[PDB]
Design an enzyme around this catalytic site. Structure first.
Site, PDB file in Angstrom:
ATOM      1  N   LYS A 109     -31.693  10.342 -14.511  1.00 51.39           N
ATOM      2  CA  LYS A 109     -31.642  11.929 -14.814  1.00 51.39           C
ATOM      3  C   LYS A 109     -31.087  12.186 -13.630  1.00 51.39           C
ATOM      4  N   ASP A 237     -47.189  19.594 -12.645  1.00 54.34           N
ATOM      5  CA  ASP A 237     -45.623  20.431 -13.507  1.00 54.34           C
ATOM      6  C   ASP A 237     -45.572  18.394 -14.113  1.00 54.34           C
ATOM      7  OD1 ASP A 237     -45.285  23.098 -14.446  1.00 54.34           O
ATOM      8  OD2 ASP A 237     -43.616  22.503 -13.228  1.00 54.34           O
TER       9      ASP A 237
END
Ligand SMILES: O=c1[nH]cnc2c1ncn2[C@@H]1O[C@H](COP(=O)(O)OP(=O)(O)OP(=O)(O)O)[C@@H](O)[C@H]1O
Ligand SMILES: O=c1[nH]cnc2c1ncn2[C@@H]1O[C@H](COP(=O)(O)OP(=O)(O)O)[C@@H](O)[C@H]1O
Ligand SMILES: O=c1[nH]cnc2c1ncn2[C@@H]1O[C@H](COP(=O)(O)OP(=O)(O)O)[C@@H](O)[C@H]1O
Lengths: 316, 300
Positions: A109, A237
């Site tokens: 990522k 989150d």
């Protein structure tokens, strides 16, 4: 013999850089333990070639690896041979910001500078957490972290073990936060081939995952200690990613691809994979894990709470 | 596991560098031919580690390899395998500006910027000559050239195959030049463990080398090429080993490894092995003539 050929020069530099850093680590001995300085160490190489070896790599580029001794130790604690890590990144170009290795084993990522700083600030306690739970965890399993420089612009990258199996196809997937607010896959998003459904696509659909008792108990215990860890680090989150593999659908799709001429998995490799219950309508396999973990800070106490309240009865 | 443990950090960097560049080269296909740009090319690496891999290497340093495709091809034309070269440099620290690899197969010479410039100026013509003579020559055989930057100062070095045997001890060394002036070993140099005699002491000693003809065939071609490229100040290095001084056997050597070694004739008085080759060709047509004449009058 490694050409490092890739769709994009930045992927080529990725391949070259993992090959270089793993080879160098081969000449570094494996220590009895980690020292504090390993958690602020780094290695940087700056390459300026000229009329040489430019078939695939760019002439000029930089590669920085963060805390290499730590991520090596982690690779070992996650049961990943360095040779196999290197081969996964370098034998063939990673594919499609998110990439996978060609063998679907690892995820790369692209992240930001702030994510890298957050990793530094949590790395010592994350490593202690991995050590004390023996790698048995729903959390991301971090394998490496780098900074590339292609044409004078930096790019940060984090390597993780894939949540999904490397060999069983995922036919549906959800991203769940348990946020009080409605998260629904956009009609555009919900028009993808494998849409990423969010919480209320999961609710309005009636989805339930049935794993019985022993796997359920393991998953809930892992979940409790993982999200208590995140909350104690004031981390927010993070989501729960779930992939459904439809065994029957896979068998049909394979018979259909073969016509153009088991249902099992290794839990030491697909470490988030769980089988459907024995008395279960459709033979299914589930991949469930926590992702998106490097964002610090209503209260993280509250996000922890709502998250676990939602995921506790995702499955029954 | 290749630790890079050496006597000085420059040697660790040299070892590391050779290791790095040779591995990179193993990932670069070998062309059907060299190209002009291959004679203008370099690889550069800058290393800046922090708190990492610091036991034997420095944490900051640079390594530069000049014309890597040309020198790899040269290595091949001299019959030297890349992994063997790499093992001779990296397996153990070079020894003692002149160095030797731990196995004495290759010498490493510290050199000036001017000579790196000169090597670039002669390299295509030198490579072509090595092609034409099928490596059958007495010139220095160049295997690699590097710049190392360690603690801010650059150090240029050139790697060659050793003139001497890598196993048989040398018992007398001479640096012949054929000059019209007189060179002699200094009285101070005369008291070294192994003096380096130059021109006048060969004459005033009476040393002759015994056997046959094809060596002057090689030598004249070499020095004709050197002169045609307006090079001077080269020398013929000669070393002599005496069997009788003293598993393995007396006078035993591998001609594929000690490429300059040559056995004495049966009509030699003492049983000897000679090593003879031209050296120091980085910097005129009279020098060719006098050098060759003097080298002519030393065989029997
Ligand atoms: O060891 C660390 N402990 C805590 N935090 C760290 C550590 N190491 C890096 N970080 C932070 O994580 C981002 C790294 O980014 P970076 O350092 O690769 O970028 P440079 O600073 O080299 O600037 P440049 O001149 O190359 O443009 C920046 O927040 C940086 O503070
Ligand atoms: O390990 C993985 N395997 C397959 N897909 C993943 C994996 N990790 C993340 N993804 C995909 O990327 C989406 C976004 O993940 P994440 O929340 O970490 O990125 P973000 O910061 O853009 O929100 C996931 O919901 C999923 O669609
Ligand atoms: O291949 C070698 N093996 C062993 N000694 C060598 C070799 N090449 C040169 N030398 C030694 O180092 C000396 C200096 O040689 P060279 O003529 O190349 O340096 P220079 O530029 O000071 O004249 C030689 O005369 C000889 O003593």
């Amino acid at each position: 013999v490694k050409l490092f050929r890739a769709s994009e020069p930045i992927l080529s530099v990725l391949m070259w850089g993992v090959n270089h850093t793993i080879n160098e680590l081969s000449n570094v001995p494996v220590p009895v333990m980690l020292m504090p300085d390993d958690f602020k160490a780094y290695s940087k190489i700056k390459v300026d070639n000229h009329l040489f070896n430019k078939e695939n790599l760019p002439s000029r580029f930089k590669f920085k690896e963060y805390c290499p001794m730590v991520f090596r130790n982690l690779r070992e604690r996650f049961g990943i041979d360095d040779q196999d890590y290197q081969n996964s990144v370098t034998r063939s170009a990673p594919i499609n910001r998110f990439l996978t290795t060609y063998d679907r084993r690892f995820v790369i990522k692209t992240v930001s500078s702030e994510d890298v700083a957050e990793m530094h600030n949590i790395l010592k306690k994350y490593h202690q957490f991995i050590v004390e739970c023996h790698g048995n965890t729903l959390l991301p399993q971090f394998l490496g972290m780098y900074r590339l420089t292609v044409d004078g612009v930096e790019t940060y990258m984090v390597v993780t073990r894939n949540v999904f199996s490397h060999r069983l196809t995922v036919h549906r997937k959800y991203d769940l936060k348990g946020s009080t607010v409605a998260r629904e896959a956009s009609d555009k998003e919900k028009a993808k081939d494998l849409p990423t459904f969010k919480d209320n696509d999961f609710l309005n659909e009636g989805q339930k995952l049935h794993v019985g008792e022993e796997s359920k108990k393991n998953f809930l215990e892992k979940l409790k200690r993982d999200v208590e860890f995140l909350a104690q680090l004031k981390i927010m989150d993070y989501s729960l990613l779930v992939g459904i593999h439809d065994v029957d659908r896979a068998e049909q799709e394979e018979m259909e691809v073969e016509e153009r001429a088991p249902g099992e998995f290794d839990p030491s490799v697909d470490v988030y994979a769980m089988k459907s219950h024995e008395s279960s309508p459709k033979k299914e396999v589930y991949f469930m894990a926590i992702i998106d973990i490097l964002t610090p800070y209503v209260n993280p106490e509250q996000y922890s709470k709502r998250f676990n309240e939602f995921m506790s009865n995702i499955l029954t």
